[PDB]
Amino acid sequence: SLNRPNMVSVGTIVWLSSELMFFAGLFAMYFTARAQAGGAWPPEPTELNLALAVPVTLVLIASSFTCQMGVFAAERGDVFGLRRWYVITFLMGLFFVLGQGYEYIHLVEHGTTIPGSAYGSVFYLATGFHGLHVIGGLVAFVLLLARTKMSKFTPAQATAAIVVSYYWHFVDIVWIALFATIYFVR
């Protein structure tokens, strides 16, 4: 029987709740800069494309499923299923990062930079900090997959997998808020 709370999970939950207030600053800056826009909020050089941000968002929304499948495999004692699903998750995350980088290059070429405008500052700051969190998540995947083959698959390793999944479900839920508030509510 199980009759205790997992404290490795409560620790990560409270930390993830605290980390939500970090993005509060970025959201505040965005909404403050948007207010003093006057006319068109995205200025003349800025042209947002939905031809690249939509597929990337869909990929970042398909990673959670695979991640949860890996977690489901973890709870049974399956060490191989976890590895397969986590590798797929890693690849999808890498796709997200490369897509975002490509969009950055495209935007910079047409004259939307950090020192160029007030829009550019907030846009790049918010999306760059999110990218940094994603890279941290990828590093976590690599570290966990490296640890899964050091020793026998004990419940502690399953707990580690579950908490890493928690973290991932926090990088893709904060990107559906940003995508909704940037590309739709302009």
Binding site: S18, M21, F27, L143, R147, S151
Partner: protein, 139 residues
Amino acid sequence: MHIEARLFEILTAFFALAAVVYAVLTAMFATGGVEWAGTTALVLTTGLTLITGTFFRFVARRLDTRPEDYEDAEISDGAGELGFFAPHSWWPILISLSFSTAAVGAALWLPWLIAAGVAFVITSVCGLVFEYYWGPEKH
């Protein structure tokens, strides 16, 4: 564990009320607009407590009463097996030093120092996480 769950939603109710009051009272008879800076903070302060409250509620519904949650409980009930705690480790100081190096690099804008700091941070975190999992040497 109901007291823990209640302590968070008690705050959640107040935070939601404060955010809603602030947003409306600023829209009318307040110079400018809706005061996006203060409104943004409170609507995420509520979320901070909401996440923890919901998680605690689910955990409390999952598991039954513990010796800690029992009024007339005996010391003999909790006897058994706690779990694992690290006796000693010298990795934390290395992690702190790595982060300090990265910070000093970022302060004076020395990209090489930043790169070195990031490499050190990754190595130190790897050392910390792979501490009680390394197997014996193979020879």
